[PDB]
Symmetry: C2
Subunit: 114 residues, 2 copies
């Protein structure tokens, strides 16, 4: 419960901060912002398409509890996955208005911040 809640809250903070950066970004600097997030923050953002396939994290350890805690903060429609279109990562969907996005985090790099 407490360790699960902690990891979820850290992942929520990362997604909210990232969404916030994109939301208030100068439109002319938006692609440059995405390069900065990826290279310097290790946070990769992508547009999310309705046809993007995903694979769930296994029901292992506290995975399902972390996912429940994430959804309670970000929304029940949030997708959380270990891969998208077969690309491995910690993937969490988010939205701005009617646009859908993914955040992808590196698993190894995330484990130092969790």
């Amino acid at each position: 419960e407490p360790r699960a809640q902690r990891v979820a809250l850290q992942l929520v903070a990362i997604v909210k901060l990232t969404r916030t950066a994109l939301l208030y970004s100068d439109p002319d600097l938006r692609r440059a912002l995405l390069q900065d997030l990826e290279s310097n923050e290790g946070v990769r953002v992508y547009p999310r398409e309705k046809t993007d396939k995903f694979k769930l994290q296994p029901d292992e350890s506290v995975n399902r509890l972390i996912e429940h805690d994430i959804r309670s903060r970000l929304g029940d429609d949030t997708v959380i996955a270990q891969s998208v279109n077969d690309i491995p990562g910690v993937w969490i969907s988010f939205k701005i208005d009617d646009d859908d996005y993914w955040v992808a985090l590196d698993r190894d790099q995330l484990d130092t911040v969790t």
Copy 2:
């Protein structure tokens, strides 16, 4: 060592994300962005003045080790404090070019994400 490194890396990620949001923000939306960061992300940003006074966190627990780990990532000139101008918080300075800023985080709220 490992728990200290973990808390520092979480605090570094928050500061880098916040700095990044401010750096790439639409200038017209910049004050609105600051309201969003404060209200929704619990991250308060302020301009930092050379005359702003600060009080160190106590040398207690792993405080000094966390501070060392933070400075190794954000820079050796980074100020980390338990108060600024007598306002309690988790305070960490940062810079954009020649402008100085503070991030202030709520201690109780931070403890759920650490």
